[PDB]
Amino acid sequence: MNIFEMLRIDEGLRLKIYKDTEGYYTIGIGHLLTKSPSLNAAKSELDKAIGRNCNGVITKDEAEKLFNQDVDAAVRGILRNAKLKPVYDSLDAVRRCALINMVFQMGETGVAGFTNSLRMLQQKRWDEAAVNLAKSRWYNQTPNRAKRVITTFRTGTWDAYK
């Protein structure tokens, strides 16, 4: 398993504009288009992102391209972030994937807000961090996905995804 297959399981793939769990306009493999209510604002962002008139629909290839950009940007963002970088550097390969997953879903800023959990992961207190991560809106809002990420941090294996 790798970051790509993990995220593909969590986000799914959709070739037409859709609303995410928060009601925002999205397309492909979890690529947020806009927090705006307007479907037109979404269609505009989409065409800007793809470089063609899409009319709310893209191809598999286009979806995978946005996905590659997004994963790269998530990684680069962690590496540039003063709060995230030290955590990432301290972790093993599997756990690294779990932090990238959180970042892709909630943004660098959002994850950087999990101060206590971050400190516990850095210290390698697996069980404690798992319990702390579950005390969040994130967990209450998307519990199945959260549980999968959480187990990954707890165990350092891919069992939740197998």
Q: Which residues are catalytic?
A: 11, 20
Say whether 91 counts as a known binding-site residue: no
> What residue ranges bind Cl ion (CB under 5 A)?
135, 142, 144-145
5 and 11 Cβ atoms separated by less than 8 Å = no
Which lies closer to Cl ion via its Cβ, residue 59 or residue 141?
A: 141
Q: Rounded to an integer, what distance in angstroms lies between the CA atom of residue 61 and that of residue 64?
A: 5
Tell me: is residue 38 an annotated ligand-binding position: no
* Residue 117 annotated in ligand binding: yes
Q: State the minimum distance, in angstroms, from the CB of residue 81 to Cl ion.
A: 24
Query: Smallest distance from the beta carbon of 20 to Cl ion, in angstroms?
Result: 11
**Backbone angles phi and psi of 67, in degrees to 5:** -65, -45
- Closer residue to Cl ion (CB): 122 or 142: 142
Whether residue 132 is annotated as binding a ligand: the answer is yes
DSSP code for 160: G
Which residues face 32 on adjacent strands? 26
Q: Closer CB to Cl ion, residue 126 or residue 139?
A: 139
Contacts of 98 (CB under 8 A, 6+ apart): 149, 152, 153
Distance in Å, CB of 152 to Cl ion, minimum: 14
CA 43 to centroid of chain Cα atoms:
22
Binding-site sequence positions for substrate: 32, 104, 117, 132
